[PDB]
Amino acid sequence: MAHSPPGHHSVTGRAEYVIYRGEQAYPEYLITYQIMRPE
Amino acid sequence: GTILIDLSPDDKEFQSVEEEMQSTVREHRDGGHAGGIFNRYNILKIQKVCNKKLWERYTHRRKEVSEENHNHANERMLFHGSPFVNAIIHKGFDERHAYIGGMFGAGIYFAENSSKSNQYVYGIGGGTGCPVHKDRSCYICHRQLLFCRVTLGKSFLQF
Ligand SMILES: COc1ccccc1NC(=O)c1ccc(NC(C)=O)cc1
Ligand SMILES: O=c1[nH]cnc2ccccc12
Ligand SMILES: [Zn+2]
Numbered sequence A: 001m002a003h004s005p006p007g008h009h010s011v012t013g014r015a016e017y018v019i020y021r022g023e024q025a026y027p028e029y030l031i032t033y034q035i036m037r038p039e
Numbered sequence B: 001g002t003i004l005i006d007l008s009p010d011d012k013e014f015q016s017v018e019e020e021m022q023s024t025v026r027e028h029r030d031g032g033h034a035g036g037i038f039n040r041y042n043i044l045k046i047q048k049v050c051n052k053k054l055w056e057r058y059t060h061r062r063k064e065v066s067e068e069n070h071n072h073a074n075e076r077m078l079f080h081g082s083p084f085v086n087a088i089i090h091k092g093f094d095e096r097h098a099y100i101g102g103m104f105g106a107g108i109y110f111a112e113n114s115s116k117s118n119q120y121v122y123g124i125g126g127g128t129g130c131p132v133h134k135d136r137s138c139y140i141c142h143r144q145l146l147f148c149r150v151t152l153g154k155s156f157l158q159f
Helices: B012-023 B052-067 B085-091 B114-118
Strands: A010-013 A016-019 A025-035 B003-006 B041-050 B075-081 B108-111 B143-151 B155-158
Touching (some): A016 B143, B012 B143
Antiparallel strands (some): A025 B041, B075 B108
16 A cells, blocks of 8 residues: 555554655654663 | 754643653553563653644645545644654655555554554664664663654544
């Protein structure tokens, strides 16, 4: 699959979401983090 | 022309994104193979990405999608993990850099679970882990996730 199916703007995988045009997402927040070691 | 606005940990906007990150952690079927073993994060920094050009590009597309989807964008806040986060915040999301052999084709993939996007921070299936320690479950190295506005419009369900 190269683009959205006809009449559609995204794919919902089942839950993950897929767009085929970069301009359909804005990277609003950049989160810097570590995964915590469980105690 | 991207500006990063550093949010204070006592700011409600920081706390909102912090809570969405911590609350959406799930157990994974790979048992932490891809993204590591953890129940919570150490939230170090949350920055608002400010780029007028990339925002107008987004809102312009969102309008087109609304008109094709009964005057609703079907906008969602979703996490993205990628080795190319630095490039994405400066030049925007780019479908031309998508791997053709993905589960749902050459697309840009998002999750409502932070721990899901965490699995892709160092590459597909966590790649070879963090650059320094080659460890997918590294507690030392600092990771970066994007919390993004995503226009889904009319979304095609696939298994
Ligand atoms: C080299 O990269 C880039 C360089 C400059 C701008 C954008 C990019 N890259 C992307 O926007 C991009 C995001 C996600 C994926 N893949 C998946 C699995 O979601 C691929 C490319
Ligand atoms: O954020 C992501 N990056 C790369 N691949 C993914 C696959 C499924 C769900 C989310 C992602
Ligand atoms: Zn490391």
